[PDB]
């Protein structure tokens, strides 16, 4: 039985536990290609089901994802409850190495759900985004305002009747009245967040740390309530990097959406391409050959080293030492020599395909990989000795913005922060994908405290492990096809397209109208550079995605920020922002 086959996951013990606790008629199990039990529960039982899952013997501890879906245009809803809208809750049990997706059906007039923020505190921003983009109210939410769109925005853009393109609306006309209006709307109002202007003795300074700040990693504002230099409270203001990428997922064919997947986490590249192409290949019923798996793993590890190099050097720069960023970007140029040679592009290769990769490896790639693998380790040891073992850097980072396993789990923190808390959870080992089980590599874990310093050094060890994986990729590279033999491999091999008529027909229709994915739901979770990145794809049977939901880790980390930094100095927050490993394209999608 192939891994992409539709399964209902009735043999999962959580289904039997829910059946024994709530009864057989309390929920409906949906057969998907997500690899996860999908359970439609009633809205009135959502909090009871969430509490029951939270207090299981091997419990579901992390709310991985929470978002909405507009089902009004979905023509293939067989076996599904009647829904105009729906809200899904992806929950992960780390100790079970399992996950479940709860789904709540909603009518058009009654678009309200009980809030999940009491069970999982990271549900706050997810519910704010679901309200922002779908107009679904969450009752009992402490502050249910817009988070992706400005406050003076009309409508909910992820609804099916909201137009996607900017050219549907009038072109952007910045006038004086409009500039004053949106600048008033952007102005922080401390009364709306429950903050005072000060105590009786002194006033609090409300400071904009961003969007244009050297330490904000993009279009990103934190509003700091400052007592001297102490942070009384902060409000991270996101949505300044909102690109409408999920809406664009409903707007591009399955093939023509791949470059958009590249720009979700723009230091990730092929790492961002991997979960999307794997989820589409689950929709298409494609099992890629071994050479495709090794090529994709090698490109993913090269871009992981690229991203980690930028992250480590920028952390060192934020701490104060500006020299290693020059050398680390030289190392990034060595990686880019290989990546440009293979894919033809530096930052956004757009090189993975449904069913494989765009081209075969060029002749002489192993020379460039060998050169980089000889170049890297002495440079990394030099960075470690010169900067990471400096005691001033240690005094800036050790013990700063620390949290444990409970705080990591309750905020959805994944990647180096979660493993710095000691929880050994990496997707490439727990749920292996793309042939990662054929490589030997270690997963570095922390001692129990997620420090700035611990997160950075864990990423250094991850860089060394990726160098080991790249050595194995260089030495044991399979001979074979770079594209699968499936009819839905998009596009087909180009030489056969150029001389064979049936291949030409397949290519013609795949690049123009698009490949037809039969109606299903698919999910792929990967270990991205900054944490766990996932694609949840709904096909309605067309050449376009009916719904493209991208879970990114930086959203969760930025929501975790005020809990972990409250009561610290501003310099601690600068170091914390440098050690999170986020970009705002990941946060806002």
């Amino acid at each position: 039985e192939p891994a992409w086959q539709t399964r209902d996951h009735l043999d999962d013990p959580v289904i039997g536990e829910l059946r024994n606790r709530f009864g057989p008629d309390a929920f409906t199990v949906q057969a998907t290609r997500t690899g996860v039990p999908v359970v439609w529960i009633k809205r009135e039982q959502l909090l009871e089901v969430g509490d029951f899952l939270k207090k299981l013997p091997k419990p579901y501890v992390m709310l991985f994802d929470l978002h909405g879906m507009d089902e009004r245009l979905r023509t293939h809803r067989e076996g599904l409850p009647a829904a105009d809208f729906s809200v899904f809750y992806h929950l992960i049990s780390i100790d079970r190495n399992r996950d479940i997706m709860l789904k709540v059906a909603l009518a058009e007039n009654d678009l309200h759900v009980p809030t999940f923020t009491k069970l999982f505190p990271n549900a706050n921003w997810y519910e704010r985004e679901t309200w922002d983009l779908f107009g679904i109210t969450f009752d009992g939410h402490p502050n249910l305002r817009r988070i992706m769109m400005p406050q003076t925005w009309k409508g909910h853009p992820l609804r099916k009747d909201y137009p996607a393109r900017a050219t549907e609306f009038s072109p952007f006309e910045l006038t004086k009245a409009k500039q004053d209006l949106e600048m008033e709307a952007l102005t922080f109002k401390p009364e709306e967040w429950g903050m005072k202007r000060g105590t009786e003795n002194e006033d609090f300074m409300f400071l904009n740390l961003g969007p244009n700040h050297p330490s904000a990693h993009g279009a990103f504002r934190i509003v700091l309530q400052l007592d001297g230099e102490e942070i009384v409270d902060c409000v991270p203001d996101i949505g300044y990097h909102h690109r409408g990428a999920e809406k664009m997922g409903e707007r591009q064919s399955w093939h023509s959406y791949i470059p958009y997947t590249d720009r979700i986490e723009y230091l990730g590249g092929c790492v961002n391409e991997m979960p999307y192409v794997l989820a589409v290949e689950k929709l298409a019923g494609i099992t890629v050959p071994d050479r495709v798996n090794v090529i994709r793993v090698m490109l993913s590890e090269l871009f992981r080293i690229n991203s980690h190099l930028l992250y480590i050097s920028t952390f060192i720069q934020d701490v104060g030492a500006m020299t290693p960023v020059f050398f680390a970007f030289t190392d990034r140029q060595k990686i880019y020599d290989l990546v440009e040679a293979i894919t033809g592009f530096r930052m956004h290769p757009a090189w993975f395909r449904i069913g494989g990769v765009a081209h075969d490896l060029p002749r002489g790639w192993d020379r460039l990989l060998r050169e980089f693998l000889d170049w890297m380790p002495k440079r990394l040891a030099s960075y470690e000795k010169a900067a990471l073992q400096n005691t001033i850097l240690k005094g800036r980072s050790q013990g700063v913005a620390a949290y444990g396993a409970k705080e990591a789990l309750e905020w959805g923190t994944t990647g180096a922060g979660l493993r710095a808390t000691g929880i050994d959870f990496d997707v490439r080992k727990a749920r292996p994908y793309s042939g990662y089980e054929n490589f030997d590599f270690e997963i570095p874990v922390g001692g129990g405290v997620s420090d700035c310093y611990t997160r950075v050094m864990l990423k250094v060890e991850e860089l060394r492990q990726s160098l080991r994986i790249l050595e194995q990729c260089l030495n044991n590279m399979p001979e074979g096809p770079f594209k699968a033999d499936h009819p839905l491999t998009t596009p087909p091999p180009k030489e056969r397209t150029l001389q064979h008529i049936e291949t030409l027909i397949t290519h013609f229709l795949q690049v123009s109208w698009g490949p037809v994915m039969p109606a299903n739901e698919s999910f792929q979770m990967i270990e991205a550079t900054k944490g766990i990145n996932s694609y949840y794809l709904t096909s309605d049977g067309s050449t376009m995605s009916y719904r493209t939901r991208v879970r990114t880790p930086s959203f969760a980390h930025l929501q975790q920020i005020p809990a972990a930094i409250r009561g610290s100095l501003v310099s601690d927050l600068i170091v914390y922002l440098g050690s999170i490993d986020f970009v705002m394209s990941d946060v806002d999608r």
């Binding site: 591009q252 093939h255 023509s256 959406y257 470059p259 958009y260 030492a321 020299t323 050398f327 030289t330 140029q333 440009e340 040679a341 894919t343 033809g344 592009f345 956004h348 757009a350 765009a358 081209h359 060029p362 030099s382 000795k385 010169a386 900067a387 073992q389 400096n390 005691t391 001033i392 596009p491 180009k494 397209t497 150029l498 001389q499 030409l504 290519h507 013609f508 690049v511 123009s512």
Partner: protein, 180 residues
């Protein structure tokens, strides 16, 4: 802090200063653009051109697959026909202020007419000049693919290639032929 921590920190500061001062004796890593040209690998995705077949005619048959495959929608062209019946673009314009250099048009091209070439220097003063018409795209050679001729494979008859003259084609047999 302890005395050992103070001495260790002094030593680490001295080590950092020493290693950067030794970097002062290292070979420079700078690639000196523009005096030394940027090396680009042969499949680097830069400026888009339209190419010609080995016979010298433009390869583009105005099939419009590149325009629909473009996720940006920054290609606009129109089919036209010569007297002998070959298809060619009457115009071909690319909005390079929009183009993301993803290469999906070249991948979708069934004639290898449109190609992304190793050239990145396309900065402009007015962005209306980033609209490249067919006169700014069509080059005088085959580009990256030296030999492929789509019309040598097509069944459609053009000048210099009658019915039955394409690759893997038999000569046409009239229905009035005496052979059974």
């Amino acid at each position: 802090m302890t005395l050992k921590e103070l001495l260790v920190g002094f030593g680490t500061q001295v080590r950092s200063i020493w290693m950067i001062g030794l970097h002062a004796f290292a070979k420079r890593e700078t690639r000196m653009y523009p005096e030394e040209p940027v090396y680009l690998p042969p499949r680097y995705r830069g400026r888009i051109v339209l190419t010609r077949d080995p016979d010298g005619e433009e390869r583009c048959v105005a099939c419009n697959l590149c325009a629909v495959a473009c996720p940006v929608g920054c290609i606009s062209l129109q089919k036209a026909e010569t007297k002998d019946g070959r298809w060619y673009p009457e115009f071909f314009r690319i909005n390079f202020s929009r183009c993301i250099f993803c290469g999906l048009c070249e991948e979708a091209c069934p004639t290898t007419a449109i190609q992304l070439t190793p050239d990145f220097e396309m900065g402009e003063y007015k962005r209306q000049d980033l609209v490249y018409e067919k006169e700014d795209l069509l080059i005088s050679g085959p580009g990256k693919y030296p030999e492929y001729n789509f019309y040598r494979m097509a069944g459609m008859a053009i000048d210099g290639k009658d019915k039955g003259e394409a690759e893997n084609e038999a000569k046409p047999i009239d229905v009035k032929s005496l052979l059974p």
